[PDB]
Amino acid sequence: AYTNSFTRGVYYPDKVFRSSVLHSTQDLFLPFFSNVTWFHAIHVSNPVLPFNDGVYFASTEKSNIIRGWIFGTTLQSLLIVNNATNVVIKVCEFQFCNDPFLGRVYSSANNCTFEYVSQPKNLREFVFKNIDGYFKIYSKHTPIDLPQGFSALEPLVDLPIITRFQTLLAAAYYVGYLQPRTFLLKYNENGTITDAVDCALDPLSETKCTLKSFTVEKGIYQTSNFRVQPTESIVRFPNITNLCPFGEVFNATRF
Amino acid sequence: SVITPGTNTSNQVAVLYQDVNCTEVNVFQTRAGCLIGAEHVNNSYECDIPIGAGICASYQTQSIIAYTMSLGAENSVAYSNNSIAIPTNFTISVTTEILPVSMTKTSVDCTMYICGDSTECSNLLLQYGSFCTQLNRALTGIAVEQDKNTQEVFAQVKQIYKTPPIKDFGGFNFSQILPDPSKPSKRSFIEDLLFNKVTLKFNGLTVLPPLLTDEMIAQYTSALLAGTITSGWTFGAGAALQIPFAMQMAYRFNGIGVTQNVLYENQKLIANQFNSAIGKIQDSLSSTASALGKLQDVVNQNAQALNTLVKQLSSNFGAISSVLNDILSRLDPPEAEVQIDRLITGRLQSLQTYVTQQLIRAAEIRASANLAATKMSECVLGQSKRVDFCGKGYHLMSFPQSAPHGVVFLHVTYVPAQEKNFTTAPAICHDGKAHFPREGVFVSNGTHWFVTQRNFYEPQIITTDNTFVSGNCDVVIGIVNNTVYDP
Amino acid sequence: FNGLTVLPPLLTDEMIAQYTSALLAGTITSGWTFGAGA
Amino acid sequence: SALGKLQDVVNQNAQALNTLVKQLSSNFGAISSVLNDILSRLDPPEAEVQIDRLITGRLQSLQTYVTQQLIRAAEIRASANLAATKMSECVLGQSKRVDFCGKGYHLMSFPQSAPHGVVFLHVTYVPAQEKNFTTAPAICHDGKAHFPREGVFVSNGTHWFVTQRNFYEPQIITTDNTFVSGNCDVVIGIVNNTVYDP
Amino acid sequence: YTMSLGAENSVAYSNNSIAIPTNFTISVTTEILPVSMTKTSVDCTMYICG
Amino acid sequence: LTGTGVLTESNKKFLPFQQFGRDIADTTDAVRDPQTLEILDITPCSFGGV
């Protein structure tokens, strides 16, 4: 199942303040109008989902019915739980069960090598990135077919710690893989991000990005080289055959 | 490359690939390359957007069409032997001509730009000799050239003429263009539009003020205007001599071959045309905001270049970091002597590029400003007969108006209209002499024969005073007969 | 060539010939007048 | 001081040339601007690096000089075309364009040589010692309106004369310095006289 | 000081008054134009490398 | 983050995670005091041509 994104999956990229300005960024983002899959928040049969290049996640529900996550390879494994007023973020779920039903527990656990804890009609959204030995948990939420309203995610967490993930399931949740699209971000006078341009969404988006402006006046503009990539790497060498005579000159009976 | 009607008209867009056939990736093929996303359409129009090789693209019933441009309405003017067309009426017209006069007087503290007050970096840069002094000299040169331009254009008038109070200019209504004692500044009503319809924090770089402040350029232009309004050309040649404005206009009509009675017999009508033209010149400027683009472009273009001069300051040039403090803190000084050298040469080269660009633009604006000076010298202080210099018409007069970095001349051109078709003859034969028209041209409708002035149908009986005798009625290629009268 | 290229002129030689034909037909038929008006 | 506009180009060019000389001492971060010295101090594998540094700097300076001389030559050519136009139009002619061949109404011009320039003696007629006269655009007589053929009408307080435009010289109003049209109605400010008839 | 643009004066305009010059002063104005630089040349190799 | 300037208290509304801040010229333009988390807004000391 599918639905398209709109202008969502955008976040403060660099922990550096800017305002009343435009800036060009090359980090991972959710491409505008990428399809996000929709999955059964109820156990009607929830499928368990692949993780690639970082996940945009969103859930639509009152009462926080989506309440946890697990991640890993062949899921040492990241685990997140929000129940009982605590965000528990241990990496301890080394024997996560084959059916991680929320409540009595998702896993068998041991060797909790990192165990950070912090204070944890409505739309909640997240981006999970892994990079450079960090796991970045951007998140934001707003009261309520995702909104066409733009929303810039602030970094809820950025942890100094994957190939697949699963979620601790009336609600629904949406998933979409990021990609390394160049973005131009516009920062308001208050330093919130107010709008963005995907520099690859269409040739007008590319032009907007290349002028560094949202309004493009009527006219004609350069944008790029168009250089065709080579289809193959042919190699031809002079049909030469024997090893060279070096076994003489490094071993002569007298230099 | 992309073509678009621009975001504020529509989100739609089409793309041009400048030298590759469409086989190599709706579609069209042109001498300018492959075009995708525009529908090729079979009639022709003026160019909204140029593509190349006579293909132009535009937004029309909606989609982006591309078309062969049409140069204009092909018409056979009905030339003939024996036939002439004479205008029976006229339409005075006012047109803006807009010229940039100066750019902003940028000045760069070169050592502060390159070295950021590092006592290290400037100790390196000192070993480049004259460069960082020479660039400052060059920018000072163009900066002084900007005041030279603005004085050389506006300061033609030897004195600040003040306009009389009652403004009884024969029914012409200059209150739209003179200063207003409502006094937001010295500015005139049209000037107050121009100062709004175009519009425009640093290290090293600074903007020096112009020598003539805007209220003072407006004061000069109010003086020039009160001159032309009250004294014609005479205030260019000597002291301003008052003359009634209707008589000045009569002289100016007599300057374009229209006999001056053609003014006095029409003055109420003439002034009503002029006032309405001024109203249009206001209303057009109050809405077609792009019309001042000739000025906005230079302001944008300079601001673009200077902005990149700042942006280049952030670039590594291969140095280990783009900030002399952040390298000098971490590197050992013997290696910093290499890294800072990389930064210095990169920044210096970029500054050298900016300064050369500003020299080239300053040379161009100096050419434009001299054209503006000659425009003011001939079209305002005078009545240049130069067949298209002071706008697309016969020139009557022009009025200057100050604009934020330029002049916006209101050229007022007499354009004739409402032609009639007449038969004509080069000469009229009587008593075997040939009579030629002393200043008019002969015309007939066939029933009779008349002389008229050349640019307005006012017929006179042919009367041996308006015509002079010559020849012997046999050498003329196409003479005709009439009973030339004799008072 | 590599990198370097020549863009075509906007007004091809046919249209420049067309304009100068128009300027001739103008001057021949009508002298100065077609500069100032019809 | 009058020849300042001409002296400046000699000074600027000399200044640019003079700094082009001074940049030979620049050193550019080589160990000495006198190249024969570094050529004696260092062995070729090093000296080639130092000379590469000097060559780079000297090129940069020379490229600057030649570029500025191109810009300056483009300026002086635009001035030369202006001078050639004034030589054509003001000397070989009497160009009536109001403020080109000097201030005033232009009569004639004489060229003069100057060491890299031209001085024009523009000779111009400037009017002076004006007086105030009442006027009318036209003279009414028999209900016809007589307009002035080439002058204007003026009143000597209480008698009406034609005078040429730019020098007071009265003539009695006649059929021959006037021409007739209209009906003494459409023209405003018309005034009455006995226009004479020879 | 604040710059003066010149001695402000009213043209004695009125709807029927003309001023006509009764006399003249023919006068001579110098105008000065540069028409060349010096013809500099640089022996590029002898400059850079001596 | 070495530099020079005048440091001023400012209304510059850093979000809680932002730990240094840059201007449209890409120079560091505001920062947070690492001893006290106060927002300090930089501007260079007064200078010009004499």
Ligand SMILES: *[C@@H]1O[C@H](CO)[C@@H](O[C@@H]2O[C@H](CO)[C@@H](O)[C@H](O)[C@H]2NC(C)=O)[C@H](O)[C@H]1NC(C)=O
């Ligand atoms: C010359 O043209 C003008 C307009 O350019 C004519 O004046 C207009 O005449 C119509 C019809 O009477 C009126 O409705 C308009 O109001 C007039 N214009 C103005 C500005 O008042 C004029 O009639 C023409 N005269 C000749 C002899 O052709």
Ligand SMILES: *[C@@H]1O[C@H](CO)[C@@H](O[C@@H]2O[C@H](CO)[C@@H](O)[C@H](O)[C@H]2NC(C)=O)[C@H](O)[C@H]1NC(C)=O
């Ligand atoms: C233009 O055409 C009209 C009519 O064809 C001519 O008008 C007549 O002219 C004569 C002589 O001036 C008058 O006596 C008549 O009274 C006019 N007709 C009317 C109805 O009044 C006019 O003369 C022609 N002009 C030319 C130059 O051919």
Ligand SMILES: *[C@@H]1O[C@H](CO)[C@@H](O[C@@H]2O[C@H](CO)[C@@H](O)[C@H](O)[C@H]2NC(C)=O)[C@H](O)[C@H]1NC(C)=O
């Ligand atoms: C200027 O006006 C004066 C009077 O205001 C004129 O004086 C008389 O002019 C009439 C003819 O217009 C002569 O017949 C008288 O002989 C004049 N009287 C005197 C005392 O000169 C005077 O002529 C006018 N100016 C000129 C140059 O004639």
Ligand SMILES: *[C@@H]1O[C@H](CO)[C@@H](O[C@@H]2O[C@H](CO)[C@@H](O)[C@H](O)[C@H]2NC(C)=O)[C@H](O)[C@H]1NC(C)=O
């Ligand atoms: C026109 O102007 C000239 C220049 O001033 C006048 O000639 C001068 O007249 C005065 C008075 O006689 C003499 O003192 C000067 O020596 C004269 N100058 C010369 C160069 O001869 C002339 O009189 C004026 N004429 C009129 C009619 O105004």
Ligand SMILES: *[C@@H]1O[C@H](CO)[C@@H](O)[C@H](O)[C@H]1NC(C)=O
């Ligand atoms: C979204 O999914 C549908 C069905 O899988 C597909 O047809 C469509 O192309 C996708 N969206 C985009 C933008 O490709």
Ligand SMILES: *[C@@H]1O[C@H](CO)[C@@H](O)[C@H](O)[C@H]1NC(C)=O
């Ligand atoms: C902790 O890790 C070791 C090594 O992988 C493993 O042998 C052990 O079983 C783990 N702990 C528990 C309680 O299983």
Ligand SMILES: *[C@@H]1O[C@H](CO)[C@@H](O)[C@H](O)[C@H]1NC(C)=O
């Ligand atoms: C910007 O911040 C101020 C201060 O909190 C606030 O009053 C204003 O509404 C904000 N405006 C926007 C557009 O963020």
Ligand SMILES: *[C@@H]1O[C@H](CO)[C@@H](O)[C@H](O)[C@H]1NC(C)=O
């Ligand atoms: C020359 O080329 C062929 C390959 O086409 C190679 O297999 C062969 O051994 C070569 N001939 C000789 C004589 O070595």
Ligand SMILES: *[C@@H]1O[C@H](CO)[C@@H](O)[C@H](O)[C@H]1NC(C)=O
């Ligand atoms: C763009 O359209 C808006 C109205 O939506 C208008 O206010 C603005 O002036 C327009 N700008 C241009 C450049 O057309």
Ligand SMILES: *[C@@H]1O[C@H](CO)[C@@H](O)[C@H](O)[C@H]1NC(C)=O
């Ligand atoms: C490529 O386009 C040009 C345009 O005139 C045409 O002459 C040529 O035949 C085209 N070639 C192919 C292979 O389509």
Ligand SMILES: *[C@@H]1O[C@H](CO)[C@@H](O)[C@H](O)[C@H]1NC(C)=O
């Ligand atoms: C243009 O008109 C011609 C008429 O001969 C027609 O054959 C051609 O198909 C038309 N072109 C297009 C793009 O419709």
Ligand SMILES: *[C@@H]1O[C@H](CO)[C@@H](O)[C@H](O)[C@H]1NC(C)=O
């Ligand atoms: C001139 O035009 C304005 C309107 O722009 C009007 O208010 C004013 O009264 C007019 N003055 C005249 C006709 O003297």
Ligand SMILES: *[C@@H]1O[C@H](CO)[C@@H](O)[C@H](O)[C@H]1NC(C)=O
């Ligand atoms: C003059 O007559 C010709 C022939 O009828 C016609 O084509 C042309 O339009 C006429 N011109 C005017 C101004 O009436």
Ligand SMILES: *[C@@H]1O[C@H](CO)[C@@H](O)[C@H](O)[C@H]1NC(C)=O
């Ligand atoms: C050309 O005009 C002249 C003068 O009316 C006449 O003699 C001659 O016959 C005309 N020729 C033609 C072809 O109209």
Ligand SMILES: *[C@@H]1O[C@H](CO)[C@@H](O)[C@H](O)[C@H]1NC(C)=O
């Ligand atoms: C003019 O009249 C004379 C005599 O009446 C005649 O010989 C001559 O042919 C006439 N003009 C023309 C062009 O026919």
Ligand SMILES: *[C@@H]1O[C@H](CO)[C@@H](O)[C@H](O)[C@H]1NC(C)=O
């Ligand atoms: C004309 O008369 C006025 C007085 O009404 C006077 O102020 C002015 O200076 C006179 N002009 C000349 C040129 O004499």
